[PDB]
């Protein structure tokens, strides 16, 4: 009857459309590449079908063709024109159907022939989504196209709007072709830019304080021994120090460096600081010299707040101010004009050192302002609270025990280190004035469990994997995990009842959290990946080290956020929260499979009798790595009893080949097991 011309890239030669026009008895051409009007092709023929064509036709076909050219389109034109349509239709929660249509001289704007409605289950995975849209379609062209053919069907144009996607535009969500409509709409849920976006910040930190500051002038701010200040008296003392600062020339994004004591006059210092412009640099005098005179180099300060008990460690380093000095108090106790903007440093601190050199983390205000916006609200702060100042002065714990309960009116307790390890009299102090909240590192919370306490009314820990929670006290407990490189912490997790792996909980405001694979793409719920951070938490990087800034600040390939590369290994659960589990570097090569030793640690502990284990992987001199499981027990635990205990809960290749009883782990002087102080095995 006719010569009819199929163009497609994806399908296959034998789709039920061809065999059907065959049928018919015409002639079908099949064409996978390009084509150009010299072709002879061209000739005999009577129509052009494309189905899932991969090129463009030239704008000289199109005119040769009008009216002749018909396209099959498994979406609800105008919706989700162009590529991967039936994705879209299922992401972007789009109207559901299929469309064949009249080609144009635009991706799939011309008028339509028929159209269809369809539905996909919430079970239905993606590649049940596209293979049911082209059965669909596929039958649809069969019923109608005798009157395609006599042409007795009205052309009408698209309805107006709809979307458009291009090729690429599924990079980021390749690893989703499997899931499922609900798991895969439950993952834009947790991960996608909210349409609906929270107000930005534009406070620093100093601007609300001194709000507060006008509200509670004459509450207690800070205590330390018998000696206190009001926020009236600090504010005032600060704006004084701060006037001197700003007088020397401090201004914005200046470092001012601070090496005090635990005191009133370290919190002084701080807000001076700020108010001047800068931001602060704590060095803890009790650091060996060579890491003070570190901090203190690869730091701009030229000016170094500090004592005449500490003055030396800086070995005429930078000027100096004593802040017992009067003469470096100004007369004006008025606050200063704010010159700052949020996207100013407010702090500098410096990460641990102990794998590479130590790095000069930088944290804007707005960073600070969201923690302790996020911060209040969440815990029910307020001025009736009262909170310890434990955490050194260089880590992010500080910034939250004084920061936090500041802007919320609250009272801060300095604890003198002298005070700090012997947590029983701690807990004598706690109950005495009536602690309420206060954040203390892993262990030092583990071990405060075991006192008897009736003050507090939360207790924060994180930063290291919590493995206890019988506690004696009335108190809610919290875990929160972040890098000090995104301020303090970036999630939180109320600790309701006990878990093998304690879940390090949801992100704070304006933060999200993605679990992305080693090619940067999205993880379904469920599966494992490398924890990424985005949001208001992301600081400004590390300080004189650009490039190794934008190694670990990225601007995603298909997304273009600027997130956090955390190094970190993590997956969301099904409630939403999210499971730590173990650092990336961590992983080993055990019989053709990526494994992280110590994923298995929870499992083995869980076990009733087992009370501490650890898993580490051993070679053979072979090139091959084989695991072995350590766990204190009463006694010896039968291979096969174990090897079945985590086969519930564990794929085969994980289960440890090795298993070594111990009555008990070589503890660090920290109190946490010494990994390689343990015997070592041979095989």
Not at 121 to 135: F, I, M
Not at 531 to 557: C, D, S
């Amino acid at each position: 009857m006719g010569r009819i011309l199929f163009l497609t890239t994806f399908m296959s030669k034998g789709n039920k459309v061809v065999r059907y026009l065959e049928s018919l008895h015409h002639e079908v051409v099949i064409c996978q590449e390009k084509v150009h009007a010299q072709s002879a092709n061209l000739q005999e023929i009577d129509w052009i079908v494309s189905y899932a064509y991969g090129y463009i036709l030239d704008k000289e076909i199109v005119s040769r063709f009008r009216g002749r050219i018909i396209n099959l389109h498994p979406s609800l034109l105008p919706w989700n024109k162009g590529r991967d349509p039936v994705f879209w239709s299922v992401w972007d929660e789009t109207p559901k159907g299929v469309t064949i249509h009249l080609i144009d001289e635009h991706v799939d704007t011309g008028d339509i022939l028929v159209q269809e409605e369809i539905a996909f289950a919430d079970e239905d995975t993606l590649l049940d989504c596209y293979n049911k849209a082209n059965q669909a379609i596929e039958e649809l062209f069969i019923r109608e196209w005798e009157n395609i053919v006599h042409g007795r069907i009205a052309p009408y144009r698209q309805t107006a709007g709809g979307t458009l996607h291009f090729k690429a535009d599924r990079d980021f969500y390749k690893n989703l072709n499997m899931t499922t409509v609900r798991e895969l709409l439950a993952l834009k849920r947790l991960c996608a830019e909210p349409k609906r976006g929270e107000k930005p910040i534009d406070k620093t930190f100093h601007q609300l304080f001194e709000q507060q500051v006008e509200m509670t002038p004459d509450h207690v701010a800070v205590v330390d021994r018998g000696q206190s200040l009001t926020y009236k008296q600090l504010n005032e003392r600060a704006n004084q120090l701060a006037h001197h600062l700003r007088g020397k020339g401090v201004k914005p994004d200046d470092q001012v460096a601070i090496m005090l004591d635990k005191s009133l006059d370290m919190i002084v210092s701080i807000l001076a600081v700020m108010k001047a412009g800068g931001a602060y640099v704590p060095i803890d005098p009790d650091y060996p010299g060579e890491r003070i005179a570190y901090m203190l180099a690869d730091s701009s300060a030229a000016i170094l707040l500090t004592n005449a008990l500490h003055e030396e460690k800086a070995n005429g380093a930078c000027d100096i101010i004593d802040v017992h000095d009067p003469d470096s108090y100004s007369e004006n106790t008025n606050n200063l004009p704010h010159v700052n903007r949020p996207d100013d440093l407010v702090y500098v601190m410096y990460t641990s050192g102990s794998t590479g050199l130590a790095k000069g983390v930088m944290i804007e205000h707005h960073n600070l302002v969201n923690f302790c916006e996020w911060y209040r609200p969440y815990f029910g702060v307020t001025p009736a609270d009262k909170a310890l100042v434990y955490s050194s002065f260089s880590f992010d714990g500080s910034a939250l025990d004084i920061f936090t309960h500041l802007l919320a009116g609250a009272a801060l307790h300095i604890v003198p280190s002298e005070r700090k390890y012997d947590l029983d009299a701690l807990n004598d102090y706690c109950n005495q004035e009536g602690i309420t909240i206060s954040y203390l590192p892993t262990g030092a919370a583990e071990q405060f469990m075991q006192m008897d306490n009736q003050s507090f009314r939360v207790v924060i820990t994180g930063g290291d994997v919590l493995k206890k929670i019988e506690r004696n006290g009335t108190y809610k407990l919290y875990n929160g995990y972040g890098p000090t490189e995104c301020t303090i912490m970036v999630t939180m997790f109320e600790v309701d009842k006990p878990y093998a792996n304690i879940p390090i909980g949801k992100p704070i405001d304006r933060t999200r959290i993605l679990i992305l694979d080693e090619a940067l793409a999205l993880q379904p719920i469920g599966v494992a990946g490398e924890l990424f951070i985005v949001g208001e938490g992301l600081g400004r990087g590390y300080l004189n080290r650009p490039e190794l800034t934008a190694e670990k600040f990225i601007v995603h390939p298909q997304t273009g956020e600027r997130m956090y590369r955390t190094g970190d290994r993590a997956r969301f659960l099904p409630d939403g929260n999210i499971e730590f589990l173990g650092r990336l570097d961590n992983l080993v090569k055990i019989r053709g499979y990526r494994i992280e030793p110590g994923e298995i640690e929870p499992f083995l502990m869980n076990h009733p009798l087992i009370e501490l284990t650890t898993v580490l992987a051993k070679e053979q001199a072979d090139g091959r790595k084989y695991l072995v499981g350590y766990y204190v027990a009463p006694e010896e635990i039968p291979h096969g009893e174990l090897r079945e205990w985590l086969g519930n809960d564990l794929p085969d290749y994980m289960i440890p080949t090795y298993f070594v009883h111990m009555k008990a782990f070589p503890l660090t002087a920290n109190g946490k097991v010494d990994r390689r102080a343990l015997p070592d095995v041979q095989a």
